[PDB]
Amino acid sequence: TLNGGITDMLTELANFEKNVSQAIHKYNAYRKAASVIAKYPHKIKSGAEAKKLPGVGTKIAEKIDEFLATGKLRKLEKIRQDDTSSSINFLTRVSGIGPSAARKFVDEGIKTLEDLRKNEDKLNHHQRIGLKYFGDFEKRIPREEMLQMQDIVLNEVKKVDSEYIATVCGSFRRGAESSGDMDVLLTHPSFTSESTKQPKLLHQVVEQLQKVHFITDTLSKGETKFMGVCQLPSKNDEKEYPHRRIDIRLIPKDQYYCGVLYFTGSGIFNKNMRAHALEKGFTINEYTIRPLGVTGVAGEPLPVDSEKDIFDYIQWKYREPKDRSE
DNA sequence: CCGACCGCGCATCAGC
DNA sequence: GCTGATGCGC
DNA sequence: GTCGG
Numbered sequence: 454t455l456n457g458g459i460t461d462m463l464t465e466l467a468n469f470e471k472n473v474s475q476a477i478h479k480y481n482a483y484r485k486a487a488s489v490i491a492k493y494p495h496k497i498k499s500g501a502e503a504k505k506l507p508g509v510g511t512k513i514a515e516k517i518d519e520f521l522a523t524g525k526l527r528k529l530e531k532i533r534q535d536d537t538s539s540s541i542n543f544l545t546r547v548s549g550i551g552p553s554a555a556r557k558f559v560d561e562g563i564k565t566l567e568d569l570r571k572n573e574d575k576l577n578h579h580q581r582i583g584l585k586y587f588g589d590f591e592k593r594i595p596r597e598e599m600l601q602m603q604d605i606v607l608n609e610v611k612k613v614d615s616e617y618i619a620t621v622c623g624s625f626r627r628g629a630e631s632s633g634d635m636d637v638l639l640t641h642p643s644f645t646s647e648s649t650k651q652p653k654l655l656h657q658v659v660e661q662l663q664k665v666h667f668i669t670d671t672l673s674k675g676e677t678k679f680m681g682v683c684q685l686p687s688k689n690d691e692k693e694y695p696h697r698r699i700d701i702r703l704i705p706k707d708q709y710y711c712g713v714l715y716f717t718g719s720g721i722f723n724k725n726m727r728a729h730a731l732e733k734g735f736t737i738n739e740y741t742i743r744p745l746g747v748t749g750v751a752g753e754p755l756p757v758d759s760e761k762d763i764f765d766y767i768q769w770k771y772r773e774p775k776d777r778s779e
Numbered sequence: 780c781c782g783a784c785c786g787c788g789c790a791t792c793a794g795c
Numbered sequence: 796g797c798t799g800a801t802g803c804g805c
Numbered sequence: 806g807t808c809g810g
């Protein structure tokens with residue numbers, strides 16, 4: 454890509470601020486700067502040319518000047534050399550180990566994959582499954598496999614109740630040739646913003662997918678969100694497929710368009726769009742878009758019949774899923 | 780200069 | 796047990 | 806770290 458070297462650098466800086474510094478606003482600041490540079494359609498020639506972009510300020514402009522002249526960033530070179538930063542950045546790659554847990558583990562002397570595998574008793578349930586599938590979870594999922602996964606989920610949900618609708622969102626819905634994981638939005642007519650006329654609507658679907666050996670593990674599970682692990686079936690004498698992360702979100706059926714907008718993303722796109730919503734006097738979540746009054750208190754939910762209706766309210770021209778890949 | 784930074788589900792824990 | 800803060804995740 | 810006011 455045109456400015457791959459710059460966007461990798463800013464991403465690495467973002468990950469540092471998140472995992473090591475625990476500086477969530479600097480994490481987001483670097484993430485925004487990398488997103489704006491990633492869509493910029495010219496090979497960047499200077500930090501001043503970059504500073505023209507929104508979210509690229511003086512500090513990042515200087516770093517870009519250093520990177521263009523030398524090919525590297527001294528600040529990152531020292532971060533890479535530091536053992537405590539390096540250890541924390543490694544441990545956070547395990548699902549369920551965050552910045553706080555990573556640092557506590559480093560305090561206890563647990564800081565390699567080997568260390569973790571000797572100390573399962575110190576892990577909670579989520580962290581133990583994340584360690585179990587550490588290698589698998591870092592592999593990408595070819596779109597071809599995403600299509601077989603889709604076919605299984607949709608057909609099994611059909612068997613439980615023909616009135617369920619399951620929609621695969623995330624990067625898959627944005628047209629990616631490969632995805633980090635599978636995200637399934639679920640609706641059923643018995644669950645609306647007005648009533649829950651049936652219990653266990655999510656459980657019954659999880660149960661069916663466990664019964665056919667598609668869902669293999671559970672990281673977390675409540676009434677409306679499932680976070681777990683799944684796996685495609687393999688043929689005779691073939692290696693098994695990698696285990697994959699799956700997220701399932703049950704959304705009230707009358708709030709589908711807000712839900713599918715949220716679950717399609719991207720994450721940075723959602724943040725940019727929600728940040729822009731507030732500037733226009735609205736607040737958007739996965740359920741509703743609501744006006745902000747004179748005091749800053751959210752008003753009642755505005756009518757939505759389409760994804761486009763949401764872009765309209767905040768005066769954005771509609772963007773197809775494939776162009777929301779910020 | 781400085782306030783504000785997207786919004787929320789589930790798990791875990793301290794205080795009562 | 797409950798509630799609110801915090802951790803971690805989407 | 807960056808931005809709007």
Ligand SMILES: Nc1nc(C[C@H]2C[C@H](O)[C@@H](COP(=O)(O)OP(=O)(O)OP(=O)(O)O)O2)c(NC=O)c(=O)[nH]1
Pocket residue numbers: 622623624625629631632633634635636715716717718719720721723724785786805
């Ligand atoms: N509002 C908001 N939403 C999200 C997650 C949303 C948007 C994302 O497209 C969707 C699924 O998350 P996931 O991590 O699977 O991302 P996805 O875009 O599918 O990428 P990938 O799986 O890595 O190919 O939930 C965020 N997560 C990360 O940015 C976030 O920070 N803010």
Ligand SMILES: [Ca+2]
Pocket residue numbers: 623624625632633634635636
């Ligand atoms: Ca995904």
Ligand SMILES: [Ca+2]
Pocket residue numbers: 623634635636699700805
């Ligand atoms: Ca996901």
Ligand SMILES: [Ca+2]
Pocket residue numbers: 589694695696
């Ligand atoms: Ca495996």
Ligand SMILES: [Cl-]
Pocket residue numbers: 475476477478479480
């Ligand atoms: Cl911060």
Ligand SMILES: [Cl-]
Pocket residue numbers: 707708709710711712740757758
């Ligand atoms: Cl909606």
Ligand SMILES: [Cl-]
Pocket residue numbers: 738740741
């Ligand atoms: Cl709401």
Ligand code: NA
Pocket residue numbers: 503504505506507508509510
């Ligand atoms: Na700028």
Ligand code: NA
Pocket residue numbers: 544545546547548549550551
């Ligand atoms: Na992690």
Ligand code: NA
Pocket residue numbers: 570571572
């Ligand atoms: Na072991």
Ligand code: NA
Pocket residue numbers: 693
């Ligand atoms: Na197996």
